[PDB]
Amino acid sequence: MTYKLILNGKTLKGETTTEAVDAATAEKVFKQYANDNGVDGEWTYDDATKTFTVTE
């Protein structure tokens, strides 16, 4: 499945997507993505749209 990540950080804002077997795996990939880009916020995941959002 293809997942999307909406990043609302203080410095970085945008949208990307990832391909993953399930949401638990996309969540790991995205968190690492966020982490590597200096983002540290609150997360939500909406299965109805397959979207993750991180917000600082």
From Swiss-Prot:
Sequence-type repeats, residues: 2-56
Protein location: Secreted, Cell wall
Role, per record: Binds to the constant Fc region of IgG with high affinity.
Protein name: Immunoglobulin G-binding protein G
Originating species: Streptococcus sp. group G
Residues of the whole record sequence present: 228 to 282 of 448
